[PDB]
Amino acid sequence: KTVVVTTILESPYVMMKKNHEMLEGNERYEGYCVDLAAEIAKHCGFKYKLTIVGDGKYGARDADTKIWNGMVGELVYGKADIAIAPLTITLVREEVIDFSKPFMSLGISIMIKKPQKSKPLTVERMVSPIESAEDLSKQTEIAYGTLDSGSTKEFFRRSKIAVFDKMWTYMRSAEPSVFVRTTAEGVARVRKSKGKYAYLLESTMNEYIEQRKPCDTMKVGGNLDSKGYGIATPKGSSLGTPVNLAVLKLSEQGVLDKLKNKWWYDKGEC
Amino acid sequence: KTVVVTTILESPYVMMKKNHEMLEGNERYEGYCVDLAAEIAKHCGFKYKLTIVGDGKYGARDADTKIWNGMVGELVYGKADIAIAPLTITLVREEVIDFSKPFMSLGISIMIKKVSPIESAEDLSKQTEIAYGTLDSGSTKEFFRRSKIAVFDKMWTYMRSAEPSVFVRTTAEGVARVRKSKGKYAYLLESTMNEYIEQRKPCDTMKVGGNLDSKGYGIATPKGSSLGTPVNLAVLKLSEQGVLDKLKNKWWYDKGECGA
Amino acid sequence: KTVVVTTILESPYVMMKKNHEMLEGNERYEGYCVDLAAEIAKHCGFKYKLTIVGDGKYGARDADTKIWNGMVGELVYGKADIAIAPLTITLVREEVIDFSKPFMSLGISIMIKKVSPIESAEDLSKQTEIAYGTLDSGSTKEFFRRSKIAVFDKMWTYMRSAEPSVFVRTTAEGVARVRKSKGKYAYLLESTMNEYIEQRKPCDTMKVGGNLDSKGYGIATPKGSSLGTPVNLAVLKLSEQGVLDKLKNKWWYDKGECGA
Amino acid sequence: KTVVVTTILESPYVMMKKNHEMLEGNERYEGYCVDLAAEIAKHCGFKYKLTIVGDGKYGARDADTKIWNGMVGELVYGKADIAIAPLTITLVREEVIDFSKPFMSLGISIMIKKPQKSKPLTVERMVSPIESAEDLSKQTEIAYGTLDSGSTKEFFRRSKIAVFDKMWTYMRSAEPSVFVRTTAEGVARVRKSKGKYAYLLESTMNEYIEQRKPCDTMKVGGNLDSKGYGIATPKGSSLGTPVNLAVLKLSEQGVLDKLKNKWWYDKGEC
Ligand SMILES: NS(=O)(=O)c1cc2c(cc1Cl)N[C@H]([C@H]1C[C@H]3C=C[C@@H]1C3)NS2(=O)=O
Numbered sequence A, D: 001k002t003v004v005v006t007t008i009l010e011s012p013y014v015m016m017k018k019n020h021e022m023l024e025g026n027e028r029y030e031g032y033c034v035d036l037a038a039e040i041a042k043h044c045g046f047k048y049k050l051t052i053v054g055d056g057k058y059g060a061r062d063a064d065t066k067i068w069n070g071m072v073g074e075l076v077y078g079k080a081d082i083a084i085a086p087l088t089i090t091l092v093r094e095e096v097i098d099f100s101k102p103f104m105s106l107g108i109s110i111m112i113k114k115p116q117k118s119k120p121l122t123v124e125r126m127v128s129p130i131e132s133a134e135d136l137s138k139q140t141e142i143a144y145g146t147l148d149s150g151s152t153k154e155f156f157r158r159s160k161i162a163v164f165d166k167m168w169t170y171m172r173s174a175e176p177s178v179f180v181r182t183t184a185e186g187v188a189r190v191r192k193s194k195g196k197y198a199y200l201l202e203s204t205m206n207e208y209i210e211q212r213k214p215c216d217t218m219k220v221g222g223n224l225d226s227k228g229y230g231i232a233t234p235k236g237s238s239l240g241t242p243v244n245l246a247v248l249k250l251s252e253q254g255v256l257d258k259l260k261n262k263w264w265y266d267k268g269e270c
Numbered sequence B, C: 001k002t003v004v005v006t007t008i009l010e011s012p013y014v015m016m017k018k019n020h021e022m023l024e025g026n027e028r029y030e031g032y033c034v035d036l037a038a039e040i041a042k043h044c045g046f047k048y049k050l051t052i053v054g055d056g057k058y059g060a061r062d063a064d065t066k067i068w069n070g071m072v073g074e075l076v077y078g079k080a081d082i083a084i085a086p087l088t089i090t091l092v093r094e095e096v097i098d099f100s101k102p103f104m105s106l107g108i109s110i111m112i113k114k115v116s117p118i119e120s121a122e123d124l125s126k127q128t129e130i131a132y133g134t135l136d137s138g139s140t141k142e143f144f145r146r147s148k149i150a151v152f153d154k155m156w157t158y159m160r161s162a163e164p165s166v167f168v169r170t171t172a173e174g175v176a177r178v179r180k181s182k183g184k185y186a187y188l189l190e191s192t193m194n195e196y197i198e199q200r201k202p203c204d205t206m207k208v209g210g211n212l213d214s215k216g217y218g219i220a221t222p223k224g225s226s227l228g229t230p231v232n233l234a235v236l237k238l239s240e241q242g243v244l245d246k247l248k249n250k251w252w253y254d255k256g257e258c259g260a
């Protein structure tokens, strides 16, 4: 019985190949998550069919309804058997699905439009108007937002830290809304809002966007917290321990480091 | 029912108190792992007693009679209920004991005494002028043993067939050997321990190059035990509340007996 | 019996004379390969007539009907007795035709128009800003096709699936394309040809980085022919007498229409 | 029928292992030629046992008796089946044995004791008393020699170039003799003659010795000529074509340059 491997469409994890209109099957995609799924199949022998969720969401729980959506939602209710995607290991998610050991480390970062060079011996320096989340929350001219139905949104929603509490209170009562429906939408908003918008996304995607043309964006400060990407699996499934052992084996063998290096730094420019 | 907690005497994870001869019970111990155990017990609601593994070894197999020794062998043979300590999550251990989600990231680093002709691990392996060894009966020696990369294979082949014994018993012995070898010996050890050592008196060592790989410390328990899910949930909740970062800052940088 | 010698029109190996219309026979050709053929004929004692291969290709297989084309195809199908030309010694060719000892060393190089953001081949492969291609129906495209290294596999995958046609018919076309693309196209070709081109007017190109590999030019003959041992001995004697170096200096650096 | 793979004892081609006393067989040696023989065995399946020639010579033909000696000699008279070693492809050698395609390029170079650094703002410069072979032949204070019963000695013996002819004329009538019996002997004489001796040897050995401690020797000028190392084989044997094909396959596969890099520059002690 072939199981379906759900995934999100987020660079560089899963892409669309240049010659993909004529291609079909698991050969339409490329990136980090496709290599991860290939190595998982190599470790434990099974047939897998790549899939993209209908709503293109990572997964959240709607209030007053308690119906999960996105990748997590479609994995819980049984239309998929695994989720090999950049899914963040979360406490609320852990109670509904099974997460393997993290295969990549990450953190919440801040992305802003890259400031221009300062002429005033004839040396150049970078002057960023934001250097940390605290001063980001202190000011009120730069608007900041996150990805809707994501993990950062829930992290800010259920946070007791003072700075994150102020950031969440500002976010939930902003007109117009500061939340974006896609990472690409947030990056485009950052690039196009004349340096007046800051996007809070994961550090891996932040670095990937920073290393690609036209590279007019940069990351300020450090990670707000530390998390990891895990391979999700429905509760009480036969695939949990095998994929966990496969992740550990790939980490020991250096496959994960090689894939990260070849998908993040080898193909960069500028 | 009192839960027996096994752990190793490692700084700043578990250390003896200044006047520990007077206190008794769990009040004679201090450190990052003690606070982590206290938070876990608060989350779960059990009475725990701290114990130190009889042999100062984390975990290894005899390789001839398939006998585990150390904290892992303490857990496998029913002598302990949980191992809250800097126990690295590895493929060999995961098959015998149950691990939780990582509570701290780490890696293999290089520590030398205070022009840096070594940079990364490649130059250290290529240059035979300076000696290098790891801790025995640990996750570093077992990592270099099974490594299939040319640089780490060369390093392991040198280390195993090296005279005299390039391995040390405890990481304190490795630190003392590095401080005493006068730039001739390099120590390979966990990154977090390297930072803690380099940020302490008399600040005669530094961490050179980058991390060789990325691993984590997991809170271990016997396979199939009823505590694994509660401790995993406790670790996740502690990570999300930001108290793990608070504990790391408290035990790593809040003291900081160095100028950096 | 007159020996038919096949060769390609390549500078400075075989070139048409300035007033070749007036002369006839072998007197209308000049170059390194012409002098090499003259020396070989002197050593062996045979009357030879120079011919140019009908199709301006060195040697390749159709890959679908197993048909050889070029100088190798000329030798295989009995149309020629010897191939004194810059024919690279390769595994595929050696199985079908007989080669002699190399008479000149070479390698795969990179040629760009006159800060060098490319250096070696690794940065050329990683950086997709600048395009790069080789000569079709030659030993360079066949080298990149069969290469099992990651960098060369990536380069080949880019080159084959490249729009428009990144391959050129003759190396003169590739040189003109490099001079015309204005720093956007890089050419991969033999090292000796690269030096000869870069040491010629108007000196608008240079050879960047090191050689990708090391190969040689061999004097080819049909498999089992009676000429293989005498031509191999002639090549060895010419190498030991130092006249091959003399010919290379005469046709490469003696003229030297550049300031270096 | 197991064939014998004869080899000379030279570095970094074939070197005795540090713990070579208790070991026996083909495990007593390490270096470049052992890896080359292993790859040759892998390409074409056959069993081989490494051996060292009795006289420790590369091979030359004498007068009167006209009896070949060394590796070439003991390969011609049938007590060896193949010579995987740094054997130079020579015209006189080719008429008695079969030579494969060269697996490594080389040339005759000059090795001298490294001069002391010059005091003269406070920059250091290296000055050498010899910069070419012509300048080496012009002077008389610095003696120079080669290896007895080698390819370089025969190259100088039959040379017709004026500089090489005069160098040979000086060599044949020098008291005491300037020739050495081993490459290590020549290097020791260079290091002990306090700058009054120059050794002419192959470029590969010259670079290898230059890259090893105490690194008090240097190479001056450039290669006098161009030659190559080939795998020898008795005339008319059934092994010439397979070893030639193996050499070509190894060269195209990138094994040869990988071995050269790992045995020449991977252990630079200076
Ligand atoms: N350098 S990285 O982000 O690509 C990366 C990150 C990680 C890797 C491996 C790599 Cl290559 N493995 C670890 C795993 C190994 C064992 C210890 C923690 C988990 C189980 N998780 S991780 O710390 O999230």
Ligand SMILES: NS(=O)(=O)c1cc2c(cc1Cl)N[C@H]([C@H]1C[C@H]3C=C[C@@H]1C3)NS2(=O)=O
Binding pocket: A089, A090, A102, A105, A106, A226, A227, A228, A229, B101, B102, B103, B104, B105, B216, B217, B236, B239, B243, B244, B245, B246, B248
């Ligand atoms: N900053 S740190 O090294 O003290 C650190 C490191 C880590 C933390 C939390 C902290 Cl504070 N949590 C993560 C865990 C949280 C969830 C996602 C990955 C594991 C499960 N592991 S981690 O990436 O190893």
Ligand SMILES: NS(=O)(=O)c1cc2c(cc1Cl)N[C@H]([C@H]1C[C@H]3C=C[C@@H]1C3)NS2(=O)=O
Binding pocket: C101, C102, C103, C104, C105, C216, C217, C236, C239, C243, C244, C245, C246, C248, D089, D090, D102, D105, D106, D226, D227, D228, D229
């Ligand atoms: N200096 S050069 O490129 O013109 C050059 C290059 C070479 C020459 C001779 C010259 Cl002059 N001879 C050798 C040959 C001689 C004997 C040893 C190797 C082959 C057989 N091949 S080579 O190493 O390819």
Ligand SMILES: NS(=O)(=O)c1cc2c(cc1Cl)N[C@H]([C@H]1C[C@H]3C=C[C@@H]1C3)NS2(=O)=O
Binding pocket: C089, C090, C102, C105, C214, C215, C216, C217, D101, D102, D103, D104, D105, D106, D228, D229, D248, D251, D256, D257, D258, D260
């Ligand atoms: N760079 S090197 O000296 O180790 C080296 C030198 C040579 C190599 C391969 C290497 Cl790696 N192969 C060539 C061979 C390939 C084909 C062309 C000439 C012979 C047959 N001989 S070579 O030009 O003598």
Ligand SMILES: N[C@@H](CCC(=O)O)C(=O)O
Binding pocket: A058, A059, A086, A087, A088, A147, A149, A150, A151, A152, A153, A200, A201, A202
């Ligand atoms: N990776 C996150 C979504 C991205 C974000 O929230 O920034 C998740 O799995 O929920």
Ligand SMILES: N[C@@H](CCC(=O)O)C(=O)O
Binding pocket: B058, B059, B086, B087, B088, B135, B138, B139, B140, B141, B188, B189, B190
């Ligand atoms: N802390 C490691 C051992 C330390 C080391 O090997 O450097 C473990 O749990 O095995």
Ligand SMILES: N[C@@H](CCC(=O)O)C(=O)O
Binding pocket: C058, C059, C086, C087, C088, C135, C137, C138, C139, C140, C141, C188, C189, C190
């Ligand atoms: N001279 C080469 C072709 C030139 C090239 O491919 O660069 C040959 O004999 O095939």
Ligand SMILES: N[C@@H](CCC(=O)O)C(=O)O
Binding pocket: D058, D059, D086, D087, D088, D147, D149, D150, D151, D152, D153, D200, D201, D202
């Ligand atoms: N390699 C040479 C000997 C070394 C030398 O003459 O320098 C040979 O095979 O004859």
